[PDB]
Amino acid sequence: TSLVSAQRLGIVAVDEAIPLELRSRSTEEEVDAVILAVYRQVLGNDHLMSQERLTSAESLLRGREISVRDFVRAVALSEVYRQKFFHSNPQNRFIELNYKHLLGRAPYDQSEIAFHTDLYHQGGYEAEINSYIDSVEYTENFGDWVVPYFRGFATQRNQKTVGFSRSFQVYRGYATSDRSGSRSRLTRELARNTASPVYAGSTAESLRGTSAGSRNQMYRLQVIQGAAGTRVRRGKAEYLVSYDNLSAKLQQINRQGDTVTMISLA
Amino acid sequence: MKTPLTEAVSTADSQGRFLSSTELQIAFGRLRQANAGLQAAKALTDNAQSLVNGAAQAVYNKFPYTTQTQGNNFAADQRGKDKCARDIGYYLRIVTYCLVAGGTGPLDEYLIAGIDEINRTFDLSPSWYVEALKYIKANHGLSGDARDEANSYLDYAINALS
Amino acid sequence: MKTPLTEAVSTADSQGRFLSSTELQIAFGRLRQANAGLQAAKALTDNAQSLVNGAAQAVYNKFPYTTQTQGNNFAADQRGKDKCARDIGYYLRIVTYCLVAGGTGPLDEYLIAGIDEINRTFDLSPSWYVEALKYIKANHGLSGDARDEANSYLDYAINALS
Amino acid sequence: MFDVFTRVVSQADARGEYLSGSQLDALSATVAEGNKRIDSVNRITGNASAIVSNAARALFAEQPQLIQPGGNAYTSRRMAACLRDMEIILRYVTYATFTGDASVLEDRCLNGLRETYVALGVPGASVAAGVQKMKEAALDIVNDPNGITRGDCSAIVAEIAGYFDRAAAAVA
Amino acid sequence: MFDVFTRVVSQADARGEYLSGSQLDALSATVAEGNKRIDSVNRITGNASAIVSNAARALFAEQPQLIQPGGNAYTSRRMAACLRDMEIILRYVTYATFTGDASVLEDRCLNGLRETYVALGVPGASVAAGVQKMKEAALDIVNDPNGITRGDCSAIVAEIAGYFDRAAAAVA
Amino acid sequence: MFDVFTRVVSQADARGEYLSGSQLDALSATVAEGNKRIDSVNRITGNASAIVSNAARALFAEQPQLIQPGGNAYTSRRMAACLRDMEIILRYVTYATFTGDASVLEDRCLNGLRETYVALGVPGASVAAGVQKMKEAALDIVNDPNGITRGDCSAIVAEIAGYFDRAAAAVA
Amino acid sequence: AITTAASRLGVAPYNESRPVELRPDFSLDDAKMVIRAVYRQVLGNDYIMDSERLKGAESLLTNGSISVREFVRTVAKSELYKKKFLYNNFQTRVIELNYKHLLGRAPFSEDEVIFHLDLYENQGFDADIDSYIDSVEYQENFGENIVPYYRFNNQVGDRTVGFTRMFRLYRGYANSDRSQLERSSSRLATELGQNTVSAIVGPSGSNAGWAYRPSRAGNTPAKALGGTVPFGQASKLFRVEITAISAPGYPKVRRSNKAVIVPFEQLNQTLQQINRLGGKVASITPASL
C-alpha cells in the first residue's frame, strides 16, 4: 500500500519489495540471492542453519538443471520444511503456512481448508504440497523463475477482500518468523466466514490519557459474549482496560461464560 | 514510579492543567535534594560490596540459626548464603536507585510491592532483612542531606518489613 | 487549593501512606520560594492602590468605549468605575494570596472557578481584565524570584481569561 | 483542607483584606522554622512502625482486658483493626505537623472517630491511652539530639504534642 | 511514566546494576540545567494561550480548507476540539520538558493519537503543521533574553524541540 | 440519529449552503405525507404482538429444525431470545418509519447484528425469513383500507418495505 | 416500587429517569448525555465549574477510547472527586459517598466498612475505587455501558436496612451531597456499628419536619421497653420525632429536636403540644406491640 497506510500497518518493506527473477545466464551471486530469497520466504524467515541447507537442490538450481519453481518445490517437500511446518502442527495451521510460504497469501475460504485436507488424506503430504506449486495461482504470479513473495497486502485479481485483513494474521511483521507447534489464528474466522479487526504495527494502540492505571498500559480484550445482569448489545465486544484492572476484567468475563478471542497491548 | 516530578505531572494531568508555580517548587525542591542524592548513591555504590557482606554477617550474627539449620529458606549452605547476599544486594541497589530518583518509587515498584507474599511463601523472616538494613544505616558513613535521604529510604524499607 | 504543602499531603493521603522523601522535597521547594513570595506580597500590598488605579486607567486607555458607552457592564458612570476598580482589586488581592500560599489555589478557588459564567452573564470582556493584569505585570517593579512567581500567577489569570 | 499559609489566606479573603505586615512576618517566622518542621516529620515517619507497635504492646500490658478472650482487641481481625487505627492516628498527626495546620487531622481522622468507637464498643479511653503512648514515644524521637544539627525545636515539639493531645481528646 | 532520573534507573534495574559514575555525572549535569528547564516550562506555560491561539490562527490562515464549511475545523464543536487538541499537545510537551523524558508525552498523549486522527479523518499533517507552529512560537518564547539571568539555553531548547517534533511525527 | 429533515440539513451544512427551493419543496411534500406516516406507525404498533407471534409460528412451522431439541430456538431462554429479536427488528422498523430516515434502524439495531448472529451461532437466514414474514403481515396491516380515510399510501409502504428488507439483508 | 411516597421522598424524579446507556456506535448527543449523567451522579449533584471539568476523560469517552465504566472510574479517581469527597471526610463518610456514587445504594453492614477501610489503608484510594467498580454488584447492575443510578427499588440481593439508609444518604433532588445538614459527618457510623435503623425523614420540600436529626446522646430509643406501664392504661405506644422546637425559648428549650414515646390516648394532646412549641413532626412510628 502507499506509505501513509504502510507505516501504520508495518508493511513498508513488503510494499517496496521487488520480485526476484532468475534470468538466463545468471551469475553466481544472482543464484545465491535467489536461493537466499527462496529460503527466506518458503521457510518463513527462519534462521536457516548451514546443515539444514539443501545442497543438492541448490546445486541443480545453480547448474541450470532445475527452475526456481522446482527449487521452491524441493524446499517445500524437504524434511526441513516438514519438521518446522508439518510434523508438529495441526492441518489447518499447516495449510495456512503453505498458503503464506508458497502463494504469499492467507486462505480465502473454508473450502480451501476442506481442500488440502481431503487431498492430504487421499494423496499424502507430497500431493498436497504440489497442489500449491502446480496451481494456476502460482503460475501466473510467479511462474518458473520468480521467487514467491507475499501478495496478501496488495489487491489481486480473483481475490476476496478478507484476504487483505487475514494477511495480517499470517504476516506478523518483517522481523517475524513462523517458528513457535501453534494453532492457526484463522480457524474461527475461516469456518464462520468472518473478518477480524486488523491490529498490526501501530494500529493496535489506543489513547490513554489519565484513564490508564499506574503503568499507563491499556489492553484490548476481544471477547465473544452472550446473555448469561445488564443487556448485551453485541455478540462481539471489545474492552479496553488498564493493567491494574486486567485480572478483574478477565475474571468477570470468565464468570459470565464469555469466550476470550484475543488480548493485545493497546 | 513515585518521584516528585512524575507525581507533580500526574496530579496536574488529572486536573488537565499546565504546570503552575506549585509544580515548579516541587522541581526546585527536587533540584535542592538531587545532588546530595547523587553523592549518596555514589558512596553507597562504591562501598556496596563491604556493605552487603557486612550486612549479611550482621544478620548471621543476630540470627545464628540461619547458618546452621537445614532448609531451603536458611543460609546453612553456600546456596542459601548466596541467596541471602543477593537479597541484601538487591536491597542496597534499589536504595541507591531511590536516592537517584528522589523518592521511594524504585523501592515500591521493584522491592516493596509483594515482598510480604515473598517472605511468607518462602518462609523468610522479615526481621533478617530489618537487621541487614539497620547495618547499612549504621555503616554507610553518609552525613547531612545524603545521610537523611538515604536513612529515609532505609527506614522506609524497615517500616514496610515490620 | 493547590499549594505545595496541601498537594503533597493530598497525594500521600490518597495513597494512604506516610509522607516520604518526595513530600519533604516539596516542602523544601516551598521553603525556598516562600520568602520571595511573602515579600512580593508585601510589595504588591503596599503599592496596591496605585497599581489598581493604574491598571484600571490602562484598561480605559486601551478600551476607550468602556468609559463612553452607557451600560451596566461599562465604566462610563462612577459606579462602573468603582466596579472596575473593585474587580481589579480582587485580582491583585487574590494574586497576593497566591503569593503567600505558594500556589494558584487562591486564584483557582476564589477567582478562576466560574469566572467564565461571570463574564458571559454580566457581559464583561476578559480582554479588559487581561490588560489590567498586563499593566500590573509591567508596573509591579518586582525582581528575581518575586517577579517570576508573581508573573506566573498573573499569567495564570490571563491564560484562564483568554 | 488548609495548610499554615492557606489558613491565613482563607481568613483574609473572607474579610477582603490583604495580609498585614504582622501576618506576613508571622508566616516568615513559620518558614524560618520550616527545616525543623521537616526534620520532625521525617523522624516520626522513619520510626512509625516502632512507635505504633511499642505503644500497642505497652497498652496491652497495662490494659490486659483489651486482649483477653472477648475483649475489644481479641481475635486477629480486631487486633489488626486496632493496630491500623494507631497507625492512622500517627499518619494524620504527621500530616498535620507537615502542613502546620490541624485541619487534615480533624477532617480526615478525628471528626467521627468518637462516634464510631461508641457505636462499636471500642473503648475510647484505651485508644486515648494508646495515642498518649504514641505521643510520648514520638516527642523524644523528635527531640533526640543525635545525628542532627543542633537547635531549639521546642515550638515544633509543642505543636506536635498539641496534635497528639487533640487526637487523644477526640477519642476519649 | 519516567522522568530523566527514573529512565536511567529503570535501565539499570533491568541490568541489575548500580548506576555508573558517568550516569551519575550525567544526572548531575542535568541537575545543573534544572533552573533553565524550569524557566522554559514557566515561559511556555505563561504564554500557553497565546502560543495555541497564534499557532491556530496561522494554521487556518495558511490552510483555509480546514475552516471552510465541511472542513475538519468547521463548526464550533470541531473548532473547539482542534483548539483543545493544540492545548493538549502543548501541555504534554511541557510535561515532557518538566520531567526531562518523553515518556509522559508518548505514553499518555501520543500513543494511539494517530489512530484516533485517522479514524476521525482529522488530517494529521495539518495537526503536525499546527504543532510545528507552536514549536517556534514556544522556542522563541523560551529564548527571549529579556528579564532573565543570561545564560546558554541551547540544550533545553533542543530538548523541547525534540518533544515538539516527536509529537508532530506521531500525529502525521 | 437522523430524521428526514435533519438528514437534508446535515448534507447542506457539510456543503455549507442554504437549502435550495427544491429541497425545501421536497420536505414540504414529506410533511404532506406525514399523516399517513403516523397512521402506518400506529397500525404496526397496534398489531406488534400478533405480527411477531404469527411470524414466529410460521417460521417454526416451515423450519422445524429451529425448534427441534438442539435447534437454535429450542429451550425456553433461546425461544424467548428469538421472540425478543423479532420484536426488536419490528420496533426499530417502526422507529425508522416514524423518523423518515433509516439511521435509527441502522445505527441502533442492524449494525453488528450479522456479526452477533454468526458469533453465537444464530442462523441469520432464518432470522431473515422471520423478518420477511413480519414484513408481509405488517404491510397488510398498513394497507388495510378498513376504518381509515382512503388515500394513496404507496410511497410510505414502499419506504416501510425498504426498512424491512434492509433488516432482512443485514441479518443474512 | 415506590408510588405513593415517591414525591414525598426524592424518589419521584428517578422513577421516570431511565438508566443512561452508551450504545455501541453511539452519537455525539449520547456521549454528552453520559458525561452529564456521570457528573451528576458520581459527583453527587455538585455544580461543576468549567475549570473543574475533566476535558481529557470526556474526550476519551466521546472517542470510544474508554467505556462508560472506565470514565466513571476516571471521574471517581480524579483530583476533583478527591477534593469533594476524600480530603475533608472521615473515611467512613468516604465509603458512604463511594457506595452512593459508584453503586447507587447505601452500605448494608459494618463488614463493608471493614473491607473498604482496610483496602484504602493497605492499597490506597485508587484501589478502593476499583473494588467498588470491579465489584460483582456494579457489573450486574450497571455493567460496562450504563451510568450508575440510585437503586431505590427492591432488588435480588437487597436488604431492607439498605432501603432505610438510602434516605440518610440522599436528601432530595435539589440537594448536592455536600450541602446536607450533617455536612462532613458520617451519616451511618452509629447505624452500621449498631446494626440499627432510623425512621425515614423525607427531604425539605414535601416534609415539614425534614430537619430532624438525633443528637450525639440523650436520644429516645426506637422501641418502648416496658410497654404501657409508665403511661398507666394505654393501648399502643408511638415514637414521635419532633424538630424545630423554639417557642418557649432557652432555657425551657434546650435541644430543638426531640423524640418522645407517647401513648395512643395522648396522641391528640401531643399534637397540640407540638403546635404550641412551634415544632414540626418528622416521623411517627409504632413503638410497642
Ligand SMILES: *[C@@H](C)[C@H]1/C(=C/c2[nH]c(/C=C3N=C(/C=C4\NC(=O)C(CC)=C4C)C(C)=C\3CCC(=O)O)c(CCC(=O)O)c2C)NC(=O)[C@@H]1C
Ligand atoms: C533559557 C531557559 C533562558 C535562561 C534561563 C536561566 N535561568 C537562570 C536562573 C534562574 N531561574 C530561576 C527560576 C525561577 N525562580 C522562581 O522563583 C521561579 C518561579 C517558580 C522561576 C521559574 C532561578 C531560581 C534561577 C537561579 C537564580 C537566578 O535567578 O539567577 C539562569 C542562570 C543559570 C542557572 O541555571 O542558575 C539561566 C541561564 N537564560 C537565558 O538567557 C534564556 C533566555
Ligand SMILES: *[C@@H](C)[C@H]1/C(=C/c2[nH]c(/C=C3N=C(/C=C4\NC(=O)C(CC)=C4C)C(C)=C\3CCC(=O)O)c(CCC(=O)O)c2C)NC(=O)[C@@H]1C
Ligand atoms: C528538632 C526538630 C531537631 C533539630 C532539627 C534541625 N534541623 C536543622 C536543619 C536542617 N535539617 C535539614 C533536613 C533534611 N535535609 C534532607 O535532605 C532531608 C531529607 C529530605 C532532611 C529531613 C535541612 C535541609 C537543614 C538545613 C541544613 C542544616 O543542616 O542546617 C536545624 C537547623 C536550623 C535550620 O532550620 O536550618 C535544626 C535545629 N535540631 C535539634 O537539636 C532537634 C533534635
Ligand SMILES: *[C@@H](C)[C@H]1/C(=C/c2[nH]c(/C=C3N=C(/C=C4\NC(=O)C(CC)=C4C)C(C)=C\3CCC(=O)O)c(CCC(=O)O)c2C)NC(=O)[C@@H]1C
Ligand atoms: C395508509 C397509511 C392508510 C391511510 C392513511 C391516511 N390517514 C389520513 C389522515 C389522518 N390520519 C390521522 C391520524 C391520527 N389521528 C390521531 O388522533 C391518531 C392517534 C394518536 C392518529 C394515528 C389524522 C390526524 C389524519 C388527518 C385527518 C383525517 O383523519 O382525515 C389520510 C388522509 C390524507 C392525509 O394525509 O391527511 C390518509 C390517506 N389511508 C389508506 O387508505 C391507507 C390504508
Ligand SMILES: *[C@H](C)[C@H]1/C(=C/c2[nH]c(/C=C3N=C(/C=C4\NC(=O)C(CC)=C4C)C(C)=C\3CCC(=O)O)c(CCC(=O)O)c2C)NC(=O)[C@@H]1C
Ligand atoms: C475511493 C472511493 C476511496 C479510497 C480508496 C482506497 N482503497 C485503497 C486500497 C485498497 N482497496 C482494497 C479493496 C479491495 N481489494 C480487492 O481485491 C477487493 C475486491 C474483492 C476490494 C474491495 C484493498 C484490499 C486495498 C489495499 C491493497 C491495495 O491498495 O491494493 C487505497 C490505497 C490506500 C493506501 O494507502 O495505499 C485507497 C486510496 N480512498 C479514499 O480516500 C476514497 C474515499
Ligand SMILES: *[C@H](C)[C@H]1/C(=C/c2[nH]c(/C=C3N=C(/C=C4\NC(=O)C(CC)=C4C)C(C)=C\3CCC(=O)O)c(CCC(=O)O)c2C)NC(=O)[C@@H]1C
Ligand atoms: C541473542 C542476543 C539472544 C537470543 C536470540 C535468539 N533469537 C532467536 C530467533 C529469531 N531471531 C529472529 C530475528 C530476526 N530475524 C530476521 O530476519 C530479523 C531481521 C528483520 C530479525 C531481527 C527471528 C525472526 C527468530 C525466529 C527463529 C528463526 O530461526 O529465525 C533464537 C532462536 C530461538 C529458538 O531456536 O527457539 C534465539 C536463541 N537468545 C538469547 O538467549 C540471547 C539473549
Ligand SMILES: *[C@H](C)[C@H]1/C(=C/c2[nH]c(/C=C3N=C(/C=C4\NC(=O)C(CC)=C4C)C(C)=C\3CCC(=O)O)c(CCC(=O)O)c2C)NC(=O)[C@@H]1C
Ligand atoms: C538473607 C538475609 C537471608 C536468606 C535469604 C534467602 N532468600 C531466598 C529466596 C528469595 N529471596 C527473594 C527476594 C527477592 N527477589 C527479588 O527479585 C527481590 C526484589 C528485587 C527480592 C527482595 C525471592 C523472591 C526468593 C525466592 C525465589 C528465589 O530463589 O529467588 C532464599 C531461598 C529460599 C528457598 O526456598 O529457595 C534464601 C535462603 N536466608 C537466610 O538464612 C538469611 C538470614
Ligand SMILES: *[C@H](C)[C@H]1/C(=C/c2[nH]c(/C=C3N=C(/C=C4\NC(=O)C(CC)=C4C)C(C)=C\3CCC(=O)O)c(CCC(=O)O)c2C)NC(=O)[C@@H]1C
Ligand atoms: C508461640 C508459638 C511463639 C510466641 C508467641 C508470642 N505471641 C505474642 C503476641 C501475640 N500473639 C498474638 C496472637 C493472637 N491473638 C489473637 O487474638 C489470636 C486470634 C484469636 C491470635 C493468634 C497477638 C495478637 C499478639 C500481640 C498482642 C498480645 O500481647 O497478645 C508474643 C509477645 C509479643 C510481644 O511483643 O509482646 C509472644 C511471645 N513466641 C515464641 O517465641 C514462640 C515460638
Ligand SMILES: *[C@H](C)[C@H]1/C(=C/c2[nH]c(/C=C3N=C(/C=C4\NC(=O)C(CC)=C4C)C(C)=C\3CCC(=O)O)c(CCC(=O)O)c2C)NC(=O)[C@@H]1C
Ligand atoms: C486500638 C488502639 C483500639 C481498638 C481499635 C479498633 N477499631 C476498630 C474498628 C474501626 N476503627 C475505625 C477507624 C477509622 N475509620 C476511619 O475512617 C479512620 C481513618 C480516617 C479511622 C481511624 C473504623 C471505622 C472501624 C470499623 C471497621 C473495622 O472494624 O475495622 C476495631 C474493631 C471493632 C469491632 O468490634 O469490629 C477495633 C478493635 N480497640 C481496642 O480495644 C484498642 C483500645
Ligand SMILES: *[C@H](C)[C@H]1/C(=C/c2[nH]c(/C=C3N=C(/C=C4\NC(=O)C(CC)=C4C)C(C)=C\3CCC(=O)O)c(CCC(=O)O)c2C)NC(=O)[C@@H]1C
Ligand atoms: C487541530 C489542530 C486539528 C483538529 C483536531 C480535532 N481533534 C478532534 C477530536 C479528538 N481529539 C482527540 C484527542 C485527544 N483526547 C485526549 O484526551 C487527548 C490526550 C490523551 C488527546 C490528544 C480525541 C480523543 C478526539 C475525539 C473525541 C472528541 O471529539 O473529543 C476533532 C473532532 C473530530 C470530529 O469529527 O468530532 C478535531 C476537529 N482538526 C483539524 O482540522 C486541525 C488540523
Ligand SMILES: *[C@H](C)[C@H]1/C(=C/c2[nH]c(/C=C3N=C(/C=C4\NC(=O)C(CC)=C4C)C(C)=C\3CCC(=O)O)c(CCC(=O)O)c2C)NC(=O)[C@@H]1C
Ligand atoms: C429468532 C428469529 C432467531 C433466534 C434468535 C436469537 N438471538 C439471540 C441473541 C441475541 N440477539 C441479539 C440481538 C439484539 N440485541 C439487542 O439489544 C439488539 C437491539 C439493540 C439486537 C438487534 C443479541 C445482541 C444477542 C446476544 C445476547 C442474548 O443472548 O440475548 C439468541 C440467543 C443465542 C444464545 O444461545 O445465546 C437467539 C436464540 N434464534 C433462532 O433460532 C431464530 C432464527
Ligand SMILES: *[C@H](C)[C@H]1/C(=C/c2[nH]c(/C=C3N=C(/C=C4\NC(=O)C(CC)=C4C)C(C)=C\3CCC(=O)O)c(CCC(=O)O)c2C)NC(=O)[C@@H]1C
Ligand atoms: C403486602 C402483604 C402488603 C404491601 C406491600 C408493599 N411493599 C411495598 C414496597 C416495598 N417492600 C419493600 C421490602 C423489602 N425490600 C427488601 O429488600 C426486603 C427483603 C430483603 C424487603 C422485605 C421495599 C423496600 C419496598 C419499596 C421498594 C420497592 O417496592 O421496590 C409496596 C409498594 C409501595 C409503593 O408502591 O409505594 C407494597 C404495596 N402493601 C399492602 O397493602 C399489603 C398489606
Ligand SMILES: *[C@H](C)[C@H]1/C(=C/c2[nH]c(/C=C3N=C(/C=C4\NC(=O)C(CC)=C4C)C(C)=C\3CCC(=O)O)c(CCC(=O)O)c2C)NC(=O)[C@@H]1C
Ligand atoms: C443566588 C440567588 C443565591 C445563592 C446561591 C448559591 N447556591 C449554591 C449552591 C447550590 N445550589 C443548588 C441548587 C440546585 N441544584 C440543583 O440541581 C437544583 C435543581 C434540582 C437546584 C435548585 C445546589 C444543590 C447547590 C450545591 C451544589 C454546589 O456545587 O454548591 C451556592 C454555592 C454555595 C457554596 O459554594 O458554598 C450559592 C452561592 N447565594 C446567594 O448569596 C444568593 C442569595
Ligand SMILES: *[C@H](C)[C@H]1/C(=C/c2[nH]c(/C=C3N=C(/C=C4\NC(=O)C(CC)=C4C)C(C)=C\3CCC(=O)O)c(CCC(=O)O)c2C)NC(=O)[C@@H]1C
Ligand atoms: C449568634 C452568634 C447566632 C444566632 C443565634 C440564634 N440562636 C437561636 C435560637 C436558639 N439557640 C438555642 C441554643 C442552645 N440551646 C442549648 O441548650 C444551648 C447549650 C446549653 C444553646 C446555646 C436554642 C435552644 C434556640 C431556640 C430557642 C430560643 O430562641 O431560645 C436564634 C433564634 C432562631 C429562631 O428561629 O428564633 C438565633 C438567631 N443567629 C445568627 O445568625 C448568629 C450566627
